[PDB]
Symmetry: C2
Subunit: 116 residues, 2 copies
C-alpha cells in the first residue's frame, strides 16, 4: 500500500535517500517541518516523492525516504531540519531486501494493532 | 476501518471496556500476553471482540477495548496481565464522541505516516 508505492518509487527513481533525524527536545512543529522539508525537496525535483514517519520521550524521532532523480545537497537537508538535530543520511541500494528492511524499520512503532 | 468496526461493536455490545496497562519493564512476550488475554475473554463470552494496541522506553504500554455482553470480573483482567502492571479499567459510555475520543487516544502513536 504505502509499501507497494515505496517499492515502485525505489525502482523508478535514481536516488532513494533514507534520512533519520533525532532531537533531544519535543518543542517545535512537526507539521511545519515536514511540510517545508517537502517543499524544499519539491523545488529540488518536481517529480520527487517523500515518505515520512514521526515516531512518538525526551525528543523527536523522524524517518524519511526521499525518492529523487537529482542528488541531494546534504547540507540543505540539515538547514530544513530542526536546529542541532542528529541526522544520518544513507543511499538505499536498489535491492528489494534493502528497501523492505528500511520500510519495516520505519514502520516498527506503527504496528501492533489487532482486532479480533 | 478498525474505527467502523469499533463503532459497530460499541453500539451492539452491552459493555465496552477500555483497559490501559502499563509496566516499568520491557521483558515479556506481548504476543503470548495478548493471545492468552484474548482466549480468556473468548472463554468469558464467545461473541466478544477485542481491539488491542501496543505502544512502543522503560516499560510496556497497552490499550485494549473489550466488547462483551457479560460483565468482566476485573480481578481476572489483572491475572491475565503482566505481574505488577498498572491497570485502569473504564466502561466507555454509549456515545459516539466518547468511543471516538478513546479510539483516537489509542491510535495516537500509530499515525504521522505521510506519502507525497
Amino acid at each position: 500500500g504505502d509499501l507497494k508505492k515505496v517499492l515502485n518509487f525505489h525502482f523508478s527513481y535514481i536516488y532513494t535517500y533514507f534520512i533519520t533525524i533525532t532531537t533531544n527536545y519535543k518543542y517545535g512543529d512537526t507539521e511545519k517541518i515536514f511540510r517545508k522539508f517537502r517543499s524544499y525537496i519539491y523545488n529540488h525535483d518536481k517529480n520527487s516523492h517523500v515518505f515520512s514517519i514521526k515516531e512518538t520521550s525526551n525528543g523527536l524521532h523522524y524517518h524519511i525516504l526521499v525518492f529523487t532523480n537529482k542528488k541531494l545537497d546534504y547540507s540543505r537537508v540539515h538547514k530544513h531540519m530542526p536546529s542541532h538535530s542528529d541526522i544520518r543520511i544513507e543511499l538505499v541500494p536498489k535491492s528489494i531486501s534493502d528497501i523492505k528492511n528500511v520500510y519495516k524499520y520505519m514502520l516498527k512503532t506503527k504496528k501492533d494493532i489487532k482486532m479480533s
